[PDB]
């Protein structure tokens, strides 16, 4: 049938016409009558792509296929303008001729399925992990601390990632294209920048909050009230939202080269082409600036914890270490991505696109690590056990 074979590359009337064109041709009928049912469909794939006359141009290639010399015809089909025009399309056709199997199309199909299950588990781990953190604090009255309010704000940021960013960013790789329009493409990117910016800014608030707490008689009591804590959280999303949506919605990120304009007008293209000014400025504002002050402030918190230091003291000192892992994990998962943004813009085509996507997804997985780190604190660990295990 080879209907799915052409469906995997980039309708019934064109297939029947190409089959009739091969039988009427006097240079394709002797070759078509000497190939197995698998290789016959690969021959029609070239006629439907190139043409009836273009396929007949390969006089040396069809002669090797007629002599059943697959290994010699594999190197002969790699020396043409068709093999250099589309390297991904030709390599699957040559492999189909050489092996006589669908291994070139099956391996590319199993990879989508196999990687699709993995990315679905990431979404499930992020959502289920963060919804557990939200529920544990919102239910138990003993976990109603100012830091947990910021943890709720941080878990909400990671929750939207696994509900609006990661799922739509996963279908963009599996389908190799974008099937949501340009309206949601500029919105999906806006949410992406927002949650990451709101995360590093929320962690920055925690570090400052823990410094005011450690300079207090209780050494661990936040000086903020319950109402003031919600005000800070509200102002964090307002500030981060202004440094995320406004640069995107007002089209301050757009590039100038023709490849970007053609991708902006294309509904099926959602590549985040940024200019040399926005890529550095936004990374500095939305990541680098809050990162430096977060490390600097929280390092002095650790310095005051060792300078002032019972059984209760170790429990709350480990809580500061728990927040130090949250800031450390968030750093060691987004820093390589934002380093590339500086590298990719300064020198074009120095970082591969696959590497850029990979490091971007390392930060996506970071949105599911925080609930597992909260299990270090027995206060969060028990609250999870009461909700899930004990029930």
């Amino acid at each position: 049938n080879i209907f799915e074979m052409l469906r995997i590359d980039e309708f019934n009337q064109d297939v029947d016409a190409a089959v009739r064109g091969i039988l009427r041709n006097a240079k394709l009928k002797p070759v078509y009558d000497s190939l197995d049912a698998v290789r016959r469909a690969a021959l029609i794939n070239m006629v439907f792509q190139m043409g009836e006359t273009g396929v007949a141009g390969f006089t040396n290639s069809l002669r090797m296929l007629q002599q059943k010399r697959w290994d010699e015809a594999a190197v002969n089909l790699a020396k043409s303008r068709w093999y250099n025009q589309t390297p991904n399309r030709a390599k699957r056709v040559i492999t189909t001729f050489r092996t006589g199997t669908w291994d070139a199309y099956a391996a590319d199909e199993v990879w989508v399925v196999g990687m699709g299950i993995v990315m679905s588990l990431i979404v499930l781990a992020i959502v289920f992990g963060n919804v557990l953190v939200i529920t544990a604090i919102a239910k138990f009255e003993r976990l109603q601390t100012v830091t947990n309010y910021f943890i709720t704000s941080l878990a909400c940021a990671d929750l939207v990632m696994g509900l609006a960013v990661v799922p739509f960013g996963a279908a963009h790789i599996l389908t190799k294209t974008w099937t949501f329009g340009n309206f949601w493409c500029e919105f999906w990117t806006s949410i992406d920048v927002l949650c990451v910016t709101a995360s590093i800014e929320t962690l920055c608030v925690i570090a400052v909050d823990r410094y005011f707490a450690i300079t207090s008689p209780f050494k661990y009591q936040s000086l903020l009230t319950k109402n003031k804590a919600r005000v800070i959280i509200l102002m964090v999303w307002i500030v981060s939202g202004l440094t995320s949506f406004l640069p995107i919605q007002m089209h301050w990120y757009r590039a100038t080269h023709q490849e970007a304009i053609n991708c902006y007008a294309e509904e099926t293209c959602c590549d985040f082409f940024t200019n040399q000014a926005y890529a550095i400025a936004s990374s500095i504002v939305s990541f680098y600036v809050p990162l430096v002050i977060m490390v600097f402030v929280y390092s002095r918190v650790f310095q005051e914890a060792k300078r002032q230091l019972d059984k209760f003291a170790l429990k709350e000192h480990k809580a500061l270490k728990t927040l130090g892992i949250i800031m450390g994990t968030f750093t060691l998962c987004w820093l390589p991505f934002f380093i590339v943004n500086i590298v990719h813009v300064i020198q074009d085509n120095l970082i591969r696109k696959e590497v850029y996507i990979l490091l971007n997804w390392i930060g996506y997985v970071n949105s599911g690590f925080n609930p597992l780190i909260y299990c270090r604190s027995p206060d969060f660990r028990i609250a999870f056990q009461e909700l899930l295990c004990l029930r």
Partner: nanobody, 119 residues
Framework: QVQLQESGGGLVQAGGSLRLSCAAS????????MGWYRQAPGKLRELVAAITSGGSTKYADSVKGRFTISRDNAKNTVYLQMNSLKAEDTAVYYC?????????????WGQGTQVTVSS
């Protein structure tokens, strides 16, 4: 390293009045929720009055309208006005301090003052 010290207890005739106070020292106090608990002879401890950080006061049905809880953040002391004392109010009153930490709220208690009502 917080400290809770009650005061104002003692002996009082039935129907009289008493004013309990609890000095808190070791935290901010203005941000922590206070409360008063009492321990009757041969009975479990019972919450009778509790005031939040904002000022929301909660009382028990057995002491509703007769007791009145309040606090003074300038002196870091939570007060408990006890009016129309009955024989059932004869208990050892404890001062509770819910100081919030990093991830959880820690409950701290005072030594406890004893209030006896003679009929």
């Amino acid at each position: 390293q917080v400290q809770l010290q009650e005061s104002g207890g003692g002996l009082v005739q039935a129907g009289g009045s008493l004013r309990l106070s609890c000095a808190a020292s070791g935290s901010i106090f203005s941000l922590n929720d206070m409360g008063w608990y009492r321990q009757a002879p041969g009975k479990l401890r019972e919450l009778v009055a509790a005031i939040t950080s904002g000022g929301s006061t909660k009382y028990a049905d057995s002491v509703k309208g007769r007791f009145t809880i309040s606090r003074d953040n300038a002196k870091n002391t939570v007060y408990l006005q006890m009016n129309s004392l009955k024989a059932e109010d004869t208990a050892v009153y404890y001062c509770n301090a819910k100081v919030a930490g990093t991830f959880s709220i820690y409950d701290y208690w005072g030594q406890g003052t004893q209030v006896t009502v003679s009929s």
